[PDB]
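EI: anyone free to look at a 128-residue chain?
SC: sure, send it
EI:
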Amino acid sequence: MPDSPTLLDLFAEDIGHANQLLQLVDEEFQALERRELPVLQQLLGAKQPLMQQLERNGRARAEILREAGVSLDREGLARYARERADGAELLARGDELGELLERCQQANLRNGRIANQASTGSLLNILR
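SC: here you go
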């Protein structure tokens, strides 16, 4: 019976936002390499709404799983998914999101090593 689209929609939205974040972090890497200072502030401004959306959507996904009485990890998602028609897609998207968030975290650490990596670093700590 359970077939609400909400969880899958949250994953779909977050994959889009994580891809956009990764691209902005790469854009920032290029700017740093090229010593383009003015753009760095603008790239921070572009990352803000994404990190907010990722934070909020993480909290949404966590709340859905918690209310279903499952653990907030891949085994819990798998339990949630088990009897759902959309279950294989849930799992596939969850795993893709986990890879993208890790890629964002790494790329941001690479930039940081070169304030504007702070909120990115924090949000990704929280989300992982």
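EI: The radius of gyration is 16 Å.
SC: 👍
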